[PDB]
Each structure stands twice: as structure tokens, then as C-alpha cells.
């Protein structure tokens, strides 16, 4: 059984500005099989209202999904994405870095 581990990027839909409504994204790609757990975190805590795209795949058969939630950035709030997959012995956490 082939198993491919997900690549992860965390970022905002629009240029992030404090007090301005936006979307926080976690893009997972390059993975197989398709079962995957993705949470968006605010200050370490799971965000409840998170949606995702319809499962699709690249030329090489690996899957990709976009997970996203509406948010208004502030100076103090920290955001991250937490991903688990059969290829990962423990969940992987990637922090949102707006200054990238």
C-alpha cells in the first residue's frame, strides 16, 4: 500500500490586517490515502466552524484539500493548523506566520 505524507501550508485568503474580516486556510496536498484529519487552532484550541473543499487530486494521483474558516486577525491571537494522517506518527502542527 502506497502512503504519501501531506505537505502543509497555513495562510490567509486575503492580505492579513488587524480588525479586517478574512479567512484562515490550511492547504494539505501530496497525500495518499485520502483519509486525513485537519484542525485549525486559535490560541491552541480547535476552531469549530471549519469547512473544506471537495476532494480532488493531482496528475500523480496525490490528494489535496483546502480547509478554511472565517476570522478577524488581531495582534495577539495565534493561529495554527494541526494535521494527522496514517503516515504521521504524531499530529503535525504548522503555525500561521503573517510576516512571511
Amino acid at each position: 500500500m502506497i502512503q504519501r505524507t501531506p505537505k502543509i501550508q497555513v495562510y490567509s485568503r486575503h492580505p492579513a490586517e488587524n480588525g479586517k474580516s478574512n479567512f484562515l486556510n490550511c492547504y494539505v496536498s501530496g497525500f495518499h490515502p485520502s483519509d486525513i484529519e485537519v484542525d485549525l487552532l486559535k490560541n491552541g484550541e480547535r476552531i469549530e466552524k471549519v469547512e473544506h473543499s471537495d476532494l480532488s487530486f493531482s496528475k500523480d494521483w496525490s490528494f489535496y484539500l483546502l480547509y478554511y474558516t472565517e476570522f478577524t486577525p488581531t495582534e495577539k491571537d495565534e493561529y495554527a493548523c494541526r494535521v494527522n494522517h496514517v503516515t504521521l506518527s504524531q499530529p503535525k502542527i504548522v503555525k500561521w506566520d503573517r510576516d512571511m
Partner: protein, 274 residues
């Protein structure tokens, strides 16, 4: 520029009870326009772009009938493949199918595709001539013989060169306001210091459509790939795409480095400097 229509289908078996999870999605270029999800309540092909909502109830009845048939084909396939590969009923397995057509700037047929994978591995694919098959192993060779006897390639070629390109043209016309519009990348550069002697320059491209783009660095006018990092193009979530490329440079020598951006929405490639 060129255009494409592609359909992607994934079925994942559910051992122990019931039929596979089936998800179908259709794209024109980089724009998703329809979906079917077997776990959703409607059991209909559903619109995902405003311009496809122009189609009447007859279109939706047809696409729903056909996509349900695709789901049944994959259900049968999962069982057949478990038999070909001598696998147990215990594990979940996956089938993936993709097909579609590319057209050039004149919207005339360029190429067609129809390929299939089992558990993420190539299984069988139509060759470029649309007349014969690439089978990866002996299970797929048994499928190849079956499909040759049933003249499957002939049916697919007629679809790919005919219906596929005809409906792509229709969609391109109906959705012209967005589908025929190019969104040039919006670019900027950021700078970070890691130490007193090493800096990072990151060249950003945002808000672009279609997804195809090239971002490169030069040092004193010569291509620079060493000490660079190019991330995978990613969806913004509003239908546009984003990408960046970074280079590590000696602090104080930032002026030597230039970022170069090529995209269909830019008449001439663009340059950025720190």
C-alpha cells in the same frame, strides 16, 4: 491562451457495510464548476460556479444520472480489483479516474486524457493517440483486453474530441466574465534577517488566475536556483492562486538580486527588487 475541461472521480471502499464514498468534481481550467458527493443529502450533481447555474433542469437530471452511473462502475471496480490483486475484505481501497480535453488558443482540440489508478498506483491509461492503452501490470492487462474487445477507446475518443470540446466551448462562452478573464499576479517582496550576515528575500505573487506561473531569481542578471525555495502554488479560496519564491543572500548585497514573474495576465514579464 489554452483551456481544459477535466473530471476527477474518487471512490474509497468502506469495509463492513455499504457502498464506497464517491466524490466527483469537474473543472474548467482552474475553476471547479460541479460536484457530486455520495455523503451529501441531495444526491444530485450540484453547481459550484455561477455560470453553470444557467443550465436547465434537463442538464442537472442528465449529469446526475451519469455521475450515479460512474459511482456504480467504481463500486464494481473495487470488487473486481480486490479479486485481481487477491486482497481481503478487511481493508479500505481507493480507485481514482480522471479524464478530459485540452484545447488551444483557437479553442480547437489539442489533447485528450483518460486514466485510472488503484490504491494510488497507475493502473490503465489511454495513450495520446486515443486509440490504445498503457496497462501497468497483468491485472491492468486483463482490463486492457476487455476494453479492446468492447471498443472502449473508440467511445472515449468520440467523447473527448467531440462532446468534451463542444461543452468546454459552451462553458467558456457562458462564463466569459470570469473564465476568459486573466488576473495578473499582484507582487511584492519581503525581507528577513536571520543573523547579522544572512538575509532572506521572499518574492510574492498573489491574486492570480489561471494557476500557471513562473517565479525565478537572478543574481547580477544570471539565473539563481541555489539557496532558493519555491513553494507549491496554493489556492487563495476566492478562486485565485498564490505562490512565493525565496532566496538567501549576504546581508547588504540585496541589490544584486531580482525576482522575475511570468504569467498569462502580464503582457511582459515583471521584475522586482528590494
Amino acid at each position: 491562451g489554452s483551456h481544459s475541461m477535466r473530471y476527477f472521480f474518487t471512490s474509497v471502499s468502506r469495509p463492513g457495510r455499504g457502498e464506497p464514498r464517491f466524490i466527483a468534481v469537474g473543472y474548467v481550467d482552474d475553476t471547479q464548476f460541479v460536484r457530486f458527493d455520495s455523503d451529501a443529502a441531495s444526491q444530485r450533481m450540484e453547481p459550484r460556479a455561477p455560470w453553470i447555474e444557467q443550465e436547465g433542469p434537463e442538464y442537472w437530471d442528465g449529469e446526475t444520472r451519469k455521475v450515479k452511473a460512474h459511482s456504480q462502475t467504481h463500486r464494481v471496480d473495487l470488487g473486481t480489483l480486490r479479486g485481481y490483486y487477491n486482497q481481503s475484505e478487511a481493508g479500505s481501497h481507493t480507485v481514482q479516474r480522471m479524464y478530459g480535453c485540452d484545447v488551444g488558443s483557437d479553442w480547437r482540440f489539442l489533447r485528450g486524457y483518460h486514466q485510472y489508478a488503484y490504491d494510488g498506483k497507475d493502473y490503465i491509461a489511454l495513450k495520446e493517440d486515443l486509440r490504445s492503452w498503457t496497462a501497468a501490470d497483468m491485472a491492468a492487462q486483463t482490463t486492457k483486453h476487455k476494453w479492446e474487445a468492447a471498443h472502449v477507446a473508440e467511445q472515449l475518443r468520440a467523447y473527448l474530441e467531440g462532446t468534451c470540446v463542444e461543452w468546454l466551448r459552451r462553458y467558456l462562452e457562458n462564463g466569459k466574465e470570469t473564465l476568459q478573464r486573466t488576473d495578473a499576479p499582484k507582487t511584492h517582496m519581503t525581507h528577513h534577517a536571520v543573523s547579522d550576515h544572512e538575509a532572506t528575500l521572499r518574492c510574492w505573487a498573489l491574486s492570480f488566475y489561471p494557476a500557471e506561473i513562473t517565479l525565478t531569481w537572478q543574481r547580477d542578471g544570471e539565473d539563481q536556483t541555489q539557496d532558493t525555495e519555491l513553494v507549491e502554488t496554493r489556492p487563495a479560496g476566492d478562486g485565485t492562486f498564490q505562490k512565493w519564491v525565496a532566496v538567501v543572500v549576504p546581508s547588504g548585497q540585496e541589490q544584486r538580486y531580482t525576482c522575475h514573474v511570468q504569467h498569462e495576465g502580464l503582457p511582459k514579464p515583471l521584475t522586482l527588487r528590494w
